[PDB]
Swiss-Prot record, chain B:
Modified how: Ubiquitinated; mediated by STUB1/CHIP in the presence of Hsp70 and Hsp40 (in vitro).
The name this protein goes by in its record: Nitric oxide synthase 1
Tissue: Isoform N-NOS-1 is expressed in brain and colorectum. Found in the Auerbach's plexus of the enteric nervous system. Isoform PNNOS is expressed in the penis, urethra, prostate, and skeletal muscle, and coexists with the cerebellar nnos in the pelvic plexus, bladder and liver, and is detectable in the cerebellum.
Residues of the full protein shown: 299 to 717 of 1429
Main location: membrane
Keywords, alphabetical: Calmodulin-binding, Cell membrane, Cell projection, FAD, Flavoprotein, FMN, Heme, Iron, Membrane, Metal-binding, NADP, Oxidoreductase, Phosphoprotein, Synapse, Ubl conjugation
Keyword Transferase carried by entry: no
A GO molecular-function annotation: flavin adenine dinucleotide binding
UniProt keyword annotation of Ubl conjugation present: yes
GO cellular component entries: azurophil granule; calyx of Held; caveola; cell periphery; cytoplasm; cytoskeleton; cytosol; dendrite
GO terms classed as biological process: arginine catabolic process; behavioral response to cocaine; calcium ion transport; cellular response to epinephrine stimulus; cellular response to growth factor stimulus; cellular response to mechanical stimulus; establishment of localization in cell; establishment of protein localization
UniProt record similarity statement: Belongs to the NOS family.
């Protein structure tokens, strides 16, 4: 059926048909919605490859052409002979860009077409991966003028020769469980921070220690590598009015780079495909700094501001939250490091949504993830009905490597 | 089938079995989620089974399932339906049904209070004047001079669909809205259409910024009638700030009693089209939505100016800063005038405790994440980190089309 999506702030109604092309399951049913759940053969391969190629040739205005038929049959024969196939560079680039385009949880998709794709399919060792990663980090960082990019390592074969980046993000801070029972550094990485130790790393036992890369090539055991400190751009956090802010000793990295997801293109699976863009202010100030299970710094900032913390009704938590986020955006803009505020980011997404509806007939979006973690209703996306569904190519979650690896 | 729900902040995992008793559809499919969509005369046939389900639930609740009383009631109702095409609920069943419709309301964060609902039986009402009296008594009871008490008033159920009882107002108390020929709006933009209907029906509008609308009441399917709610019964709170003396000069105020009056209460197959209910406000409803929505009073700018914030670039978060102070103002004003109100931190914390309790004693708690998470400071409230399952259980409250779109004028 043809579904319609309305914006209750502007009355604008959009009709969605793109969902009719969805193939994967959402996790919901006619009786139950699981919209807030974080994680809901040669015979299988060709139809997938066919699906992909058809849309590829359709995008290049050559659907049903000789070239299309030729390619479709070449891949077909290749699969029947090699149980798999290889994507042309042009197809790989198209696929990576569309996987981003179809990422329902990403609010920054208005940038989808500008993706720089690095073909790392000729890689064979961990030192090789380290080289490709350093180059990606340096390219995307661009002295502070961040550029979107993704590096694609060799596709899956027999499931035993998988390339995998063990880190969840190329750049993250370590976490250590102290005697006090408390946590030093980022609590979210405690476990990983230990697998590094349990592997050889020499943790400076610090609050903000950039973790090392744990690279896995061809299924072998992962190796560690220190990212050239000179390549890891960091920003000191200070408030544009509270001189005492710098005394908190807070800093964060400028390059957000997810490295544990799986890129699926035409049936082929790329288990190591780290990608990076740039931060939206709230990701750091609200989630990394204020989540109770993270650096949880609200009380500290609350105290230094001297606001009544006796009653929650004084909204001291809210007041403190705003100041921390103003500081983050100020520190990044002052160090000339790319970053976008939730107001600007959400405005762009709405524009992107309208473009996608009139050009592709729709745009899968996960409201739960798209609406910012603070000031939700004062951003335009809060009032925008959204339809979530899965389209391929796509980025998927996958089990951690240390829970499936056979040393 | 068992369904696990996890809180990523506490790692506490809960198991849901209650969904197995869900019957109504959600709108979602196995290929698409419609979780963020605002809006996703029965026959004797589909009536007794609906009646049976409810009665079994009721007798099981009082530990009398299978009792002679339980069996006799089923026979009584069956005979009634086949004999008259419908049936009448006993007072006890109505109270149980009303409380559970609230308990099952997936979009309500105030459910920890469900068992404390005061139910007023207005099923003997026959005229609009009759309805007005019942509503006035409800408003006075619930207000209780500022110490708000939850309540619901239930008018006669639907019969053939042509004698419906309806409260045309969306809320018992709301401010009028007026569109100016220059395109601007005086008052609350959200109530312009209804305000026009009221004027056309003869209401003499004072055309101000905060004029309490009159009640438009429909009884027995007849044309609706206008009634002014006694001013002395409408509790209002002047909004001021604890530190900003200029805030009060913004001339802002709001009523203390939120009273939804356009929903349909479904109990055991019976439909009650007029069932106004009220509780008390959570601060953000007024401060964030009624005052700051671009399509409502939209006071962000004026407030940001007076605070002299840097409004040249959004990156200064002047909207966020102004938003917090306005919400501080709302909470402070209500508490000072001793009118019940709850902040979002307290309300969401209570909901989490309610939800965990329900999972243990009931086996589940349907919840709509999109609606439960507050419209400001989302992630610093426990609910943001709580996975929730949304499904429909009956008794329940449902939306129904606006009466002016379906009413046959006499
Ligand atoms: C251009 C700048 C970009 C911005 C402003 C942006 C912003 C966002 C934000 C705010 C989120 C939510 C993060 C979280 O809460 O964990 C997100 C998620 C995501 N983005 Fe983007 N993004 C950008 C670039 C990218 C790129 C380059 C790709 C891939 C090629 C991408 C793929 C995704 C995916 C797959 C998710 C969901 C990840 C998950 O489930 O953890 N994004 N993005
Ligand atoms: C004790 C005070 C109560 C509080 C703090 C509370 C709070 C809330 C809030 C914050 C919402 C969302 C409002 C919106 O964004 O439009 C809501 C919705 C709702 N509540 Fe409660 N509530 C309370 C009492 C009640 C009562 C007495 C009932 C019924 C007997 C009830 C039934 C519902 C329903 C059905 C909805 C959804 C209405 C809609 O879809 O517009 N609530 N409540
Ligand atoms: N802006 C981002 N954001 C995505 C990565 C940063 C994000 N703030 C983060 O820490 N994501 C983690 C933590 N929670 C997610 C999960 N799925 O559990 C992954 N990416 N980009 O390429 O520009
Ligand atoms: N706290 C409430 N809140 C619900 C009523 C107030 C709410 N803020 C409101 O104005 N609801 C309207 C506007 N949006 C809803 C809709 N369905 O479109 C109804 N109720 N209570 O019983 O205590
Ligand atoms: C339980 C709930 O799904 C979870 O807390 C989600 C909510 N929305 C989110 N939205 C974004 N962007 N990022 C997140 O990590 C989350 N967490
Ligand atoms: C489109 C989206 O569903 C809509 O804006 C919803 C979001 N969450 C909400 N949550 C509450 N409590 N109240 C609302 O009116 C809404 N509006
Ligand atoms: Zn759903």
């Amino acid at each position: 059926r043809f579904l319609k999506v309305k914006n209750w702030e502007t009355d604008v109604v959009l009709t969605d048909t793109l969902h009719l092309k969805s193939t994967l399951e959402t996790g919901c049913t006619e009786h139950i919605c699981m919209g807030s759940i974080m994680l809901p053969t040669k015979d299988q391969l060709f139809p997938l490859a066919k699906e992909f190629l058809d849309q590829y040739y359709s995008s290049i205005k050559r659907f049903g052409s000789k070239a299309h038929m030729d390619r479709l049959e070449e891949v077909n024969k290749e699969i029947e002979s090699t149980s798999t196939y290889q994507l042309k560079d042009t197809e790989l680039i198209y696929g990576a860009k569309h996987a981003w385009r179809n990422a329902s949880r990403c609010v920054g998709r208005i940038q989808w077409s500008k993706l720089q794709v690095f073909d790392a399919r000729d890689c064979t060792t961990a030192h090789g991966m380290f080289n490709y990663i350093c180059n990606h980090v340096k390219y995307a960082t661009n002295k502070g003028n961040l550029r979107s990019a993704i590096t694609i390592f060799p596709q899956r074969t027999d499931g035993k020769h998988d390339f995998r980046v063990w880190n969840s993000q190329l750049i993250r801070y370590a976490g250590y469980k102290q005697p006090d029972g408390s946590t030093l550094g980022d609590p979210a990485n405690v476990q990983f921070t230990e697998i590094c130790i349990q592997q050889g790393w020499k943790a400076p036992r610090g609050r903000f220690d950039v973790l090392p890369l744990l690279l896995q090539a061809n299924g072998n055991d992962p190796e560690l590598f220190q990212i050239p400190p000179e390549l890891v751009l960091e920003v000191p956090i200070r408030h544009p009015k509270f001189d005492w802010f710098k005394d908190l000793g807070l800093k964060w990295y400028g390059l957000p780079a997810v490295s544990n997801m799986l890129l699926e293109i035409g049936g082929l699976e790329f288990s190591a495909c780290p990608f990076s863009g740039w931060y939206m202010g709230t990701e750091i100030g609200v989630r990394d700094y204020c989540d109770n299970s993270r650096y949880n710094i609200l009380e500290e900032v609350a105290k230094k501001m001297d606001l009544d913390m006796r009653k929650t009704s004084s909204l001291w938590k809210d007041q403190a939250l705003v100041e921390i986020n103003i500081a983050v955006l100020y520190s990044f803009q002052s160090d000339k490091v790319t970053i976008v505020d939730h107001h600007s980011a959400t405005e762009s997404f709405i524009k992107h949504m309208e473009n996608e509806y009139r050009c592709r007939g729709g745009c899968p979006a996960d409201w739960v993830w798209i609406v910012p973690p603070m000031s939700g209703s004062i951003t335009p996306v809060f009032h925008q009905e959204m339809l979530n569904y899965r389209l391929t190519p796509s980025f998927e979650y996958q089990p951690d490597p240390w829970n499936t690896h056979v040393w």
